[PDB]
Design a protein around this ligand. Structure first.
Ligand SMILES: CCCCn1cc[n+](CC(O)(P(=O)(O)O)P(=O)(O)O)c1
Ligand SMILES: CCCCn1cc[n+](CC(O)(P(=O)(O)O)P(=O)(O)O)c1
Ligand SMILES: [Mg+2]
Ligand SMILES: [Mg+2]
Ligand SMILES: [Mg+2]
Ligand SMILES: [Mg+2]
Ligand SMILES: [Mg+2]
Ligand SMILES: [Mg+2]
Lengths: 346, 346
């Protein structure tokens, strides 16, 4: 309910993001064509998702700032910082779709796969990242949390690029080595690639906006949010193979891209050495027959049932973590976000 | 002479950049393999160039800071900010080589063209950009110019991505339209894509480090440096076709990539309508015969002689600009940089 009620206002206020990013550079008409390319990149790549991450900034801002201090202006700042998280997301996905050789995202063909786009998408992704800091400057330059916000977005992008390097190093194409797909490797990838920017970044932006900047409170929040990010990435892995791509909005590639998925880790931990070899022969290869052979091994080992058991235990554990670590922040902030990701099918 | 004397110290101190970026994240051993990938990216992509841009930071810092304030520590900061400019450069070139489909850079194959690299180079480029802000934090966090430095590197990357969009929009592959290659378009591309980061960025970093942060002094410096950047990019265009690739360290692609080069603008301005059509039929295409036909048109129109005339007039003009705008900064700062780029063959 809390996410669903703020949605509308948050989405409507994307026109303004687009205007402020296009308008404040028409005192420079020579870049006009670039500005129009920017708008086209924003509209195709920041729109059409669920907005969980940016909505989180706005929800937690209401819940943490005293209503006497929710003036029209500090609200406007809140949904801008929210949009900055949506722009970080857009930047990582556009690049990620190239590196993953993916086909669709959010119901449409991937940006790079569009006629006349291709690898120009690389500079388009870098421009989306640039917008974040332009926004921060335009809306938040005179706020006492300004430098905290800048350092947070930069630190969060470095961690996520470190996690991406791990994702890629662990998945060399044409190079099946099942030995490297362990639980410890897995947890490291997902912590870096997904957990800091999807879960720590947004609540923490909102903390810094409410004046809550203590080390110890940031660490306690981080303890909850990183375990949630781990679950959330294990969920994304499961949906790559078994979700319905008209719900997820994307076709799966993990088996073909030779990925250290949660599924292949769970597989490897249960496999007869005969099953092992079937995995070995069929994994990380573009042939549909061969992907279907892996999928069939996974179903033979009840990996869907194991995913549903893990979802429940992970959820009880996250809840225990909230009871331990939420104070002095209102638990509603952690609970509202957990509700939105619990048993998602997209 | 001034560049040549600081070189050694500047280069030697790259081991330290590499150590500080690898060491201060081994309290996190799970990212070990990513850290090693980072070192490999740094060594292949920040090393082997002339270091003009980073050396500029260090040279202008000596020339602008009072020697009583050139303590061992503020010097160390100076050659770090220098290296941050070399890392911005490395980030743009790695991406640019993909978008340009280039073959070599600085005497070796392009990063993305290395066996086992490919499009993973996209995340490698984004990591190189991340390092800049990690450095700024590690060395400069408590300096009064810290936030000026952060905003400068970010603003300079946005401008250069705007210029890249223009570079790419003006060069759609498979789409010969000679109508868009004008002088005004050209000047706009080069101002954004090259001039702010190669020329304004480094002197200005050094200004902010010496306490010189006035609007008006920054604008005056900018007036000189942007015209120098324009010349410098016109030079790079000329070398793409007529430089010797054992000096430049790179094979040219401008004709094949359908580029708004200086050469094609000068061509279009002198061409008989018969010459025009030869250009039209042969431009922006991968066939060697067809590139050689364009090259031969260019030589038939004395474009090499016109380049040498422009080099001289541009140089006299830059010098006039220094006489007008250099004060209260020592002219040595502008003169030393102009000497290093005047009649370069790489
Ligand atoms: C650069 C940012 C790295 C984090 N990142 C990127 C994409 N995803 C989710 C994916 O699950 P991934 O390719 O599987 O990790 P997707 O299913 O493609 O959306 C997370
Ligand atoms: C993203 C940064 C845009 C600025 N940029 C990139 C490369 N160069 C110089 C080149 O001249 P370009 O491809 O010709 O413009 P190169 O000969 O390839 O080194 C400038
Ligand atoms: Mg992906
Ligand atoms: Mg991925
Ligand atoms: Mg996925
Ligand atoms: Mg290039
Ligand atoms: Mg280029
Ligand atoms: Mg060039």
């Amino acid at each position: 309910d809390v996410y669903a009620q703020e949605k509308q206002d948050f989405v409507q206020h994307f026109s303004q993001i687009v205007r402020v990013l296009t308008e404040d550079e028409m005192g420079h008409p020579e870049i006009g064509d670039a500005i129009a390319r920017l708008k086209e990149v924003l509209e195709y790549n920041a729109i059409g998702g669920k907005y969980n991450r940016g909505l989180t900034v706005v929800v937690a801002f209401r819940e943490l700032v005293e209503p006497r201090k929710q003036d029209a202006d500090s609200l406007q700042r809140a949904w801008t910082v929210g949009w900055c998280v949506e722009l970080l997301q857009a930047f990582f996905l556009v690049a990620d779709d190239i590196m993953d050789s993916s086909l669709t995202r959010r119901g449409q063909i991937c940006w790079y796969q569009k006629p006349g786009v291709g690898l120009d998408a690389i500079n388009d992704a870098n421009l989306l990242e640039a917008c974040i800091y332009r926004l921060l400057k335009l809306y938040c330059r005179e706020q006492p949390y300004y430098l905290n916000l800048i350092e947070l977005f930069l630190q969060s992008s470095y961690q996520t690029e470190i996690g991406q390097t791990l994702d890629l190093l662990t998945a060399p194409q044409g190079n099946v080595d099942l030995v490297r797909f362990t639980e410890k490797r897995y947890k490291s990838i997902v912590k870096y690639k997904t957990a800091f920017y999807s879960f720590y970044l947004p609540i923490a932006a909102a903390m810094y906006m409410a004046g809550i900047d203590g080390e110890k409170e940031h660490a306690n929040a981080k303890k909850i949010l990183l375990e949630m990010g781990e679950f959330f990435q294990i969920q994304d892995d499961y949906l790559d193979l078994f979700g319905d791509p008209s719900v997820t909005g994307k076709i799966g590639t993990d088996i073909q891209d030779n990925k250290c998925s949660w599924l292949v880790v769970q597989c490897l931990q249960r496999a007869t050495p005969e099953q092992y070899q079937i995995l070995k022969e069929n994994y990380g290869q573009k042939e549909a027959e061969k992907v279907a052979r892996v999928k069939a091994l996974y179903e033979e080992l009840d990996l869907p049932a194991v995913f549903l058991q893990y979802e429940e235990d992970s959820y009880s554990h996250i809840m225990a973590l909230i009871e331990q670590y939420a104070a002095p922040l209102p638990p509603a902030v952690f609970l509202g976000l957990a509700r939105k990701i619990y048993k998602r099918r997209k």
